[PDB]
Amino acid sequence: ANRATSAFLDNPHPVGVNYVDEGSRQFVAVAELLASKLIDSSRESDESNSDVPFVQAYSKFADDNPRHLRVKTGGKMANALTNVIRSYYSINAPAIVPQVEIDRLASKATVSGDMYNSYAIFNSVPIVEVLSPARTTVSIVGSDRADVTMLNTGAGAANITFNFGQIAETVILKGSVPFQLARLNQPMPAARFTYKLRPLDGPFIVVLPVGNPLVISATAATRIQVPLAFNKALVESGFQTAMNDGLFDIQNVNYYSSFDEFIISQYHAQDGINRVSTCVILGLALQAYDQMRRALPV
Amino acid sequence: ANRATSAFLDNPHPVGVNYVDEGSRQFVAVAELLASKLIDSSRESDESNSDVPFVQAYSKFADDNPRHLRVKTGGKMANALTNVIRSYYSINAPAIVPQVEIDRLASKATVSGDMYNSYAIFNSVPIVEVLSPARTTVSIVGSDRADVTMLNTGAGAANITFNFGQIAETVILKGSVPFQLARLNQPMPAARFTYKLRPLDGPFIVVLPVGNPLVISATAATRIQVPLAFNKALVESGFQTAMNDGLFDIQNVNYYSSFDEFIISQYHAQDGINRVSTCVILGLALQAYDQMRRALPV
Amino acid sequence: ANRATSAFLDNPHPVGVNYVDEGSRQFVAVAELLASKLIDSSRESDESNSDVPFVQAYSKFADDNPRHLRVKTGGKMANALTNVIRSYYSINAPAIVPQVEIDRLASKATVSGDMYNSYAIFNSVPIVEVLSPARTTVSIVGSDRADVTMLNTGAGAANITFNFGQIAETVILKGSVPFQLARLNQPMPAARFTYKLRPLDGPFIVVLPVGNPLVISATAATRIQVPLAFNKALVESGFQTAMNDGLFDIQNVNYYSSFDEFIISQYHAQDGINRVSTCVILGLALQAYDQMRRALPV
Amino acid sequence: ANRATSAFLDNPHPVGVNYVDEGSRQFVAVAELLASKLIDSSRESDESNSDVPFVQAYSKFADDNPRHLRVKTGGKMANALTNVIRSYYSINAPAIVPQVEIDRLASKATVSGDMYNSYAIFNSVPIVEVLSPARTTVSIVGSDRADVTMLNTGAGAANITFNFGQIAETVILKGSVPFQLARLNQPMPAARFTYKLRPLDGPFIVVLPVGNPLVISATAATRIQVPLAFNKALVESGFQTAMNDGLFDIQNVNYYSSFDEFIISQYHAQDGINRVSTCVILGLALQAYDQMRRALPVR
Amino acid sequence: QAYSSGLSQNSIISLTGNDRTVADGTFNSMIMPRAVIANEREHFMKTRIDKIEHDLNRSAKQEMMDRQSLAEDYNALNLAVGQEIKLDIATQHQLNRLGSAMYKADHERETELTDLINRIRENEVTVNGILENQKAITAAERADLLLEVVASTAKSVSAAGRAAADGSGVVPVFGPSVANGIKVGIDIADSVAEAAIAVKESGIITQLNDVYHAFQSVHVAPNDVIKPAAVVAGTSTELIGNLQAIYSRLRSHSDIGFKKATVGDVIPNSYMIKPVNSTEYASWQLYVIHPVQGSLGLVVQLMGDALTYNVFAQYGNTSASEFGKTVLTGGATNTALEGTKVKFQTKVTAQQALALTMALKDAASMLSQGELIGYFEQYINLALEPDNLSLQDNMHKYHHLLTSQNSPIDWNYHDEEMHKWLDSRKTTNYDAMQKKDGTVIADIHIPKVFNDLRNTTLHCKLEGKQTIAGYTVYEYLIGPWAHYGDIDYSVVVDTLNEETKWYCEVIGIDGHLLIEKSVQHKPEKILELTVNDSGVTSFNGRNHDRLKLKVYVKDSLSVKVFRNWIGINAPRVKTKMFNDHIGVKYDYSHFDKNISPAHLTLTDLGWHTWDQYNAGNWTNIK
């Protein structure tokens, strides 16, 4: 027997345990609202033929009136956001920012620090394990779309077991050729192109006939509670920027291509519920980082 | 010979035939406009401490004043939208919303209710048919980007026929190694990495030399008339929510990973001109469904 | 030995050298600002139940009042925008827009003409070369996520050389099974699923054990200076629209699936630093084209 | 195998690439509008027994007051319209009208240069190719209605492949006797007198039995975008007038019996989408030409 | 794209009405068709009645007793080595039971068609008048008129009338009845002794048991065929040619059906898939028909009010799927539907099942969903034509199209491909079993002598109902031939008397040959014929496509006729079509003549031509 698993699910490193209180979550919400206003100030500046809309938003964000010679960097709020982002990623990251500074920055805007008002759908495919007989080969490639290429060389048809975990809500399988799939201890149906499955149903058995390889393409949907202001387009852009700037360069941490892979991997850990709450605050922090750094590149 | 086809193009199920009149299309447009105001009201309620923008938005949407100890569900409009969405997906889904209720809800706002103002680009690649000789193996994987893996175990070079249908406007093929492609009964050009093709030109012949396998990556663009308020990102998110919420579980219906491949699959069926009209209305309903459910979960 | 390279990096055609001055850069930015107002004028018309918002928006864009029975094409601004897009793609495309017409249109609104205010992250992964020994086979598939399949048929373990270029900031490698990767002279580490690399670090050596094939998935991030109004969602839609409309139909040019591939390919070509500057203006021109044509489909 | 094609589809000569901008399109529309006023004023002069309405309209058209002993030809506006018409037909025709003259004439009347407001139906039947076996004879005659005469002299039934192109919308096939027609790789149906076909469906196979010849009559309809002022009767009359006066006598050009044949032939050539735009402006110009000469005749 | 036939169809009015649902407690509700395969009570009752008919005519106790006599008769034929039919082997005995019953039904049907041709040719003037005067009436009404002007024995075209007119010998073979009590899976381990081989020969393998449990023969009566034959017939010659063309196709399918059992493969089973929990107004049905006597299969799907069908070849399957290549498409049929599967045996041919499917597809809009279900299942399971007169005529018009020269399906191509595929399967199964077990074991379980119904040496028992001056007349029709070579005919006569004088008469176009044998309980060779590649023989200087053999026995108990080909796997003759039957015409009117053995003299025996006789008195020459 051989076991194959998704690469991004392996060894999720512990996330930080600081800056998760009500006051700190309000600061992240305040920064996101202020950073959003900073981006829209540029469009308003063009319409008004003046820098007044931008100067207003930068003064609120950075608590200082900009001078022409100075390179605008965001001031104390930008520094606080950066250090908070590093702390969330790893338990080894130090917590530089004091709580007094966080509370002062959180009072700049009137916005709640809630994180459970809305939901979001994440598309990473959690193939926890694939168990296959001896004379067969199985390879798993991809995160957003998981392609499983299976080829057997034995005389008889082989049974391959797919485990998609318990977190995901819906998994849709499509094959290069029609194939047979059924739940554990269930009758095998006729060959079909597509299957819609609920991961809580149990391990799924795939009949693999001898001959040409069979490739199954997998897509998954998972619901995670997020703030209403959450925007997946901005969060993913902020994730790449944070990696580029080295905010995640800490010893003994894992690395992921997208924030979708990061949050799904932590959800499948033993303490998944506690880890996800920290990761959602990181996503809103990354959303603010993307807006603030695009308006004020350094 | 051997034949291969895209999985998502197989057996498109019939769509609903109710709620496709002008008045019903006005109701879908009204719901999209009012649902968008619900999401926007949250940000306005942050700039100004008042909850007046949300109360006004919810009162128009649900015909009742929001209450603190009562769950916010969307009122009669939410029930109408959910049931109308079920009807579009399948012809077996019952149509239980009275027309007098649809007409009443369509009078809440003055919108065009028109479905053909603008267009949108859909990225599904319709590989209808790949015809291969006896001693060759062809496998097709992927829907947004299709990779076709071809291996020639024969004595000489083999000719492989590609059929992309007549609906798609442009197809771009990129290979791992340079390859030769030409139309039926036409001289063959020099090998090159990428090809831009018009699917209406005709079947395309690819020379497959004996040796290492050749993989062709296909991308297609298709233009479909949609309302001016159409937003692809919101429709795709709403499509995943509806599948997880159980709106699409009806007997004898096909399932798709994305709304992109759902509309393209229906377009390639017979009477596909008429099917797309219904699918576009379903997209705007899904756009309204996503915004409403994110603002008012469960 | 064998050399494998990404398809989209091969032979970037020269880009246009016209309409890159400060006066023409203002025209593209002005066109984007005014083309946006057309899209929002549709929503404001519904709220006010009048066409006054659209009349003001179209009159500023086209310099004529909207009239029924006349196809709304956008006037002289649309004609100029279409032609400058043609000139940007190819150096052989004629430049037929007079400078006095460019200056007149640019005076319609006041905008910031700087195209280096902000930045964007681009996801195309550059694989310049993969060097493999005699007894191994390497295949590269994909542009957004590159899957590299290597199979070792020889007796002993082989070393594969990966060259990711010098432009990209970070590259993340994920494998189907754990693998060992190191620099040119660094010692091999223990096998692990994922690696984070800096392309400027140097060529990377991967050991390929005999047996089952190993698949490596690559993801890269690149930072390019762009105007603050840049939006990747709108640029990609405009790129597909322009290709379908035939704006890029000119001899001796290359064709790409996405604007992401086009800008990365030109970056890695000779004289890449001054080629991406032209491509950025093309992206903002395509962003205006998408918004204008969706509001005024012809 | 033997190949037969329609005569009017063969070798479409390139159309002109000049006077296709918005300013020139406005000039053609202005000329058509002013020519219509010229023909109506001449009718009014006949009914009122007074030359005032005609002199009134000729002054706007020709920018000159009519004088006795001088032939009325249309002034500078007629000179521009006649020479622009020649340039539209062929790329070998010279471009000799200055831009200052086009701009001045385009400002005479207020009108849009839009050439895509409406549509028209054209009845030329495109038969790109008919492929037949060795022992059969195929002849194609006609453009508005195409009669294909097929005779089989072989031992058994033969299959004839019909290609109607990709541009035409519908093709109606009527046979002298019932016959069988089906698409490629499709079972043959029962013998029928008439077939309604979609040219995009693909090549069509006709079973030709041994015996008396079978004649298939073909009618086609296609939709082309035209301005609202387009009138097919006026355009066709102008096309014959331009031919008689010799404006279409240019080197290395092809001659067509009707404007319907001309526009369909250019549509089916390569880059036909770009050619058909120029042909539409030519049709409106020919409509103005037809009305101008009928108002001001020469013996 | 679905196949579109331009066939003209009559309008169809449903019993349900405009609302497409029948009213409760009405006369229309009582005459509505209803499902027979789906309903368990009916699918059980019909199987019981089908079994009863088989046991009435063919009793297992009698057939087991006749094994000893039949084995001796086959041995006495003195066949060459490698061509001997050893009935002591259980597998050979089982295959002979299937072969003998199938051939008897095919022979009787061919005999009735030959008489029907004679009546039509005698009354040609009246028949020609009916065909040209009455072209607007229904096909069933035309058949009733044609069967009346001719003095046909069976003048009824109704289903109830056809059942009553049918006699023993044409009843379909019930497969499960044949394979009852036969030992399966006898195991001898590494023993080559004579005792071990004797025990091995007494049993059959599991594969043959499965083949017999899925076998049910189909034999179409001439009265069924006359309706399709007269839909477009204008002259009597065209009608006769159509009748012969249909039966040529029917007979070729019967030979293929027997060949399926001879090879070592198991035959597929026709089944119906229905929803697990059927919901009103959301029901669906999937029908998969694998006709044993045929080269093509049918898949019919009823989703909503849409009818979709597919015709698939039964040859060339890779064992990965049960469906071959699609030859004719009528839409998209999903065979991967999930639901309860019900197994049934079809009583109609593939050409008959397809004709109703095409007719029902054209009437989908005008007929309710229940009517489509009832009419299809009744015809497939009971061979009951729809009561809707307009729908019945539409089915017959399509049936003519599928058999005519302009059929959308090339039946000759598919039938030939099935013979080649079946021959390959027999070689593969024999070679595989020759390796795993011995050659002796392979010969027992896969006999090489049994190839197809009209190739294998088979016996046909004759029934006698006519007595002329104390001599019972037994009739056997020699031919037509689907294979070419040399063919020998033998007659076995059993009589209670110790010494008996029995006669044989062979009738041709011009004259008849009379023989006397006077040998009991042993085969006696009567005729040796050479058949050319066109299926005709030269009998006394003239080309004959068939002959008639009449055997006269006094106090007879059983008369059997044996048919034998010189070489095994005789080459086949291309199946005749309408043009072939029209081109050459043979007169069969002389098959009705009889002789009186009692008033026979020595000079009358031998070969004599009709001119030597008076009118009547064919026994005695002038």
Q: Which residues of A touch B39 (CB under 8 A)?
A: 228
Chain C contact for B236 (CB, 8 A cutoff): no
Angle formed by the axes of helices B272-295 and B75-89, nearest 10°: 150
Query: How many beta carbons lie within 10 A of that of residue D73, not counting itself?
Result: 15
Residue C220 near residue C126, CB atoms below 8 Å: yes
User: How far apart, in whole angstroms, are the C-alpha atoms of residue D99 and residue D27?
Assistant: 11
Nearest in space to C147 (alpha carbons), one of B124, A220, A9, A147: A147
Chain C contact for B91 (CB, 8 A cutoff): no
DSSP E592: G
Interface test mutation site (partner B, options E4, E303, E333, max chain B beta carbons within 10 A): E303
Query: Which residues lie across from C221 on neighbouring strands?
Result: C170
Nearest in space to C173 (alpha carbons), one of C160, C185, C157: C160
User: How far apart, in whole angstroms, are the C-alpha atoms of residue E366 and residue E15?
Assistant: 10
Q: Is E202 exposed, middle or buried (0-12, 13-18, 19+ CB in 10 A)?
A: middle
Which is it for the CA torsion B19, B21, B27, B33, positive or negative?
A: positive
Residue holding tokens 């002598």?
E449
Q: Which two tokens stand for residue E184?
A: 């399966």
The string over A100-121, giving b where at least 16 C-beta atoms fall within 10 Å of a residue's C-beta and e elsewhere, is ebbeebbebbebebebebbbbb
- C280-to-C94, C96, C143, C285 alpha-carbon distances in Å: 20, 21, 20, 9
Angle formed by the axes of helices D22-48 and D52-62, nearest 10°: 170
Q: Give kind and range of the element (H or E) at residue E606.
A: strand E606-608
Residue holding tokens 């899209």?
C39
Q: Which two tokens stand for residue C130?
A: 């993969």
Residue A139 near residue A151, CB atoms below 8 Å: no
Phi-psi region of C273 (alpha: psi -120 to 50; beta: other; left: phi over 0): alpha
Residue holding tokens 């919308």?
D169
Q: Which two tokens stand for residue B65?
A: 């004043």
* Type of residue at C114: D
User: How far apart, in whole angstroms, are the C-alpha atoms of residue E35 and residue E380?
Assistant: 11
A75 CA: distance to closest CA in chain B (Å): 22
Angle formed by the axes of helices A52-62 and A75-89, nearest 10°: 50
Nearest by CB to A255, from C110, C177, C196: name it: C196
DSSP result, D213-232: -EEEEEEEEEEEEE-TT--H
User: How far apart, in whole angstroms, are the C-alpha atoms of residue C174 and residue A5?
Assistant: 12
User: How far apart, in whole angstroms, are the C-alpha atoms of residue E238 and residue E129?
Assistant: 14
Q: Which residues of B touch E332 (CB under 8 A)?
A: 11
Write out E393-456 in H/E/C secondary structure.
HHHHHHHHHHHCCCCCCCHHHHHHHHHHHHHHHHHHHHHHHHHHCCHHHHHHHCCCCCCCCCCC
Chain C contact for D99 (CB, 8 A cutoff): no
Dihedral Cα A60, A62, A67, A68, nearest 10 deg: -100
C46 CA: distance to closest CA in chain D (Å): 26
Residue holding tokens 């064919």?
E618
Q: Which two tokens stand for residue B218?
A: 């296909």
Give the HSE-up count for residue D233: Cα atoms under 13 Å, Cβ half-sphere. Answer: 0
Q: Does an interface of 3+ CB pairs under 8 Å exist between E and B?
A: yes
Checking C275-280 for CB contacts under 8 A at 24+ apart, the result is: C275/C12, C275/C15, C276/C224, C277/C20, C277/C115, C278/C15, C278/C16, C278/C17, C278/C20, C278/C88, C279/C15, C279/C88, C280/C115, C280/C224, C280/C225, C280/C226, C280/C227, C280/C230
Q: 3-state DSSP helix/strand/coil percent for chain A, to nearest 5? A: 35, 25, 40
User: How far apart, in whole angstroms, are the C-alpha atoms of residue E621 and residue E607?
Assistant: 11
User: How far apart, in whole angstroms, are the C-alpha atoms of residue E418 and residue E423?
Assistant: 9
B116 CA: distance to closest CA in chain D (Å): 17
| CA A39 to chain centroid | 23
Longest dimension (CA), chain B: 78
Nearest in space to E561 (alpha carbons), one of E598, E514, E524, E512: E524
Residue holding tokens 């011009």?
E510
Nearest in space to E316 (alpha carbons), one of E218, E420, E431, E233: E420
Which is it for the CA torsion D5, D8, D13, D17, positive or negative?
A: negative
Pure H helices in chain D: 22-48, 52-62, 75-89, 99-106, 232-245, 259-268, 272-295
Residue B164 near residue B124, CB atoms below 8 Å: no
The string over D144-164, giving b where at least 16 C-beta atoms fall within 10 Å of a residue's C-beta and e elsewhere, is eebebebbbeeeeebebbbbb
DSSP result, E515-541: EE----SS-EEEEEEEE-TTS-EEETT
Q: Is C26 exposed, middle or buried (0-12, 13-18, 19+ CB in 10 A)?
A: buried
Chain C contact for D17 (CB, 8 A cutoff): no
Give the HSE-up count for residue E432: Cα atoms under 13 Å, Cβ half-sphere. Answer: 9
Mapped onto helix, strand or coil, the DSSP state of residue D89 is helix
Q: Is B159 exposed, middle or buried (0-12, 13-18, 19+ CB in 10 A)?
A: middle
Q: Which residues of D touch E6 (CB under 8 A)?
A: 189-192
The backbone torsions φ and ψ at residue E448, rounded to the nearest 5 degrees and listed phi first, read -85, -15
Q: Which two tokens stand for residue B107?
A: 């009078």
User: How far apart, in whole angstroms, are the C-alpha atoms of residue A29 and residue A81?
Assistant: 11
| CA E279 to chain centroid | 40
User: How far apart, in whole angstroms, are the C-alpha atoms of residue A105 and residue D49?
Assistant: 92
| Contacts C–D by Cβ distance under 8 A | 11
Query: How many beta carbons lie within 10 A of that of residue A133, not counting itself?
Result: 17
User: How far apart, in whole angstroms, are the C-alpha atoms of residue D276 and residue A166?
Assistant: 61
Give all strands of the β-sheet with E326-329 in edge-to-edge order. E326-329, E306-313, E296-303, E284-289, E271-274, E340-343
CA nearest D202 in B: which residue?
A: B202
User: How far apart, in whole angstroms, are the C-alpha atoms of residue E200 and residue E197?
Assistant: 5
Nearest by CB to A110, from B46, B137, B255: name it: B46
Give the HSE-up count for residue B120: Cα atoms under 13 Å, Cβ half-sphere. Answer: 23
Nearest in space to B216 (alpha carbons), one of B167, B165, B178: B178
C67–D114 C-beta distance less than 8 A: no
* Type of residue at E166: D
Residue E149 near residue E121, CB atoms below 8 Å: no
Instruction: Tell me whether the omega of the peptide bond preceding residue B213 falls within 30 degrees of 0, making it cis.
Output: no
Chain B contact for A83 (CB, 8 A cutoff): no
The string over E90-107, giving b where at least 16 C-beta atoms fall within 10 Å of a residue's C-beta and e elsewhere, is bbbbbbbbbbbbbbbbbb
Q: Give all chains having 3 or more CB-to-CB distances under 8 Å with chain B.
A: A, C, D, E
Q: Which two tokens stand for residue D58?
A: 């000729």
Q: Which two tokens stand for residue A60?
A: 């609120």
Q: Which two tokens stand for residue E229?
A: 């034959």
* Type of residue at B256: Y
Query: How many beta carbons lie within 10 A of that of residue C225, not counting itself?
Result: 16
Residues 6+ apart with CB under 8 A from A70: none
The backbone torsions φ and ψ at residue E416, rounded to the nearest 5 degrees and listed phi first, read -65, -40
CA nearest B166 in D: which residue?
A: D200
User: How far apart, in whole angstroms, are the C-alpha atoms of residue E245 and residue E228?
Assistant: 11
| CA-only gyration radius of chain A, Å | 24
Q: Is B296 exposed, middle or buried (0-12, 13-18, 19+ CB in 10 A)?
A: buried
Chain A contact for E276 (CB, 8 A cutoff): no
| CA-only gyration radius of chain D, Å | 24
Q: Give kind and range of the element (H or E) at residue D298.
A: none
A233–B244 C-beta distance less than 8 A: no
User: How far apart, in whole angstroms, are the C-alpha atoms of residue A35 and residue A108?
Assistant: 12
* Type of residue at C127: I
To one decimal place, what's the resolution in Å?
Answer: 2.6
Nearest in space to A86 (alpha carbons), one of A11, A15, A29: A15
User: How far apart, in whole angstroms, are the C-alpha atoms of residue B248 and residue B239?
Assistant: 10
Residue D166 near residue D200, CB atoms below 8 Å: yes
User: How far apart, in whole angstroms, are the C-alpha atoms of residue E604 and residue E607?
Assistant: 8
What experimental approach yielded this model?
A: cryo-EM
Residue holding tokens 């279900």?
E373
Residue holding tokens 């219509």?
D36
Residue A165 near residue A199, CB atoms below 8 Å: yes
User: How far apart, in whole angstroms, are the C-alpha atoms of residue E471 and residue E462?
Assistant: 14
User: How far apart, in whole angstroms, are the C-alpha atoms of residue E376 and residue E373?
Assistant: 5
Q: Which two tokens stand for residue C213?
A: 């094939």
Query: Which residues lie across from E551 on neighbouring strands?
Result: E474, E504
Residue E622 near residue E601, CB atoms below 8 Å: no
Q: Which two tokens stand for residue B134?
A: 């006896």
| CA E119 to chain centroid | 23
User: How far apart, in whole angstroms, are the C-alpha atoms of residue E43 and residue B86?
Assistant: 39
Q: Which two tokens stand for residue E569?
A: 């796997």
Nearest by CB to C255, from B110, B119, B196: name it: B196
User: How far apart, in whole angstroms, are the C-alpha atoms of residue E52 and residue E49?
Assistant: 5
Nearest in space to E604 (alpha carbons), one of E505, E519, E490: E505
User: How far apart, in whole angstroms, are the C-alpha atoms of residue C3 and residue D139?
Assistant: 58
User: How far apart, in whole angstroms, are the C-alpha atoms of residue C14 and residue C216?
Assistant: 32
Chain A contact for B246 (CB, 8 A cutoff): no
Q: Which two tokens stand for residue E386?
A: 């729809």
Q: Does an interface of 3+ CB pairs under 8 Å exist between B and A?
A: yes
Q: Give all chains having 3 or more CB-to-CB distances under 8 Å with chain A.
A: B, C, E
E401–D189 C-beta distance less than 8 A: no
DSSP result, chain B: -EEE--GGGS-PPPPP-SS-SHHHHHHHHHHHHHHHHHHHHHHHHHHSS--HHHHHHHHHHHSS---SSS----HHHHHHHHHHHHHHH-SSS---S-HHHHHHHHTSS-----S-SEEEEE------EEEE-TTEEEEEE-SSSEEEEEEE-SSS-EEEEEE--SS-SEEEEEEEEEEEEEETT------EEEEEE-GGG--EEEEE-SSS-EEEEEEEEEEEEE-TT--HHHHHHHHHHHHHTTTT--SS----S-HHHHHHHHHTSTTHHHHHHHHHHHHHHHHHHHHHHHHS--
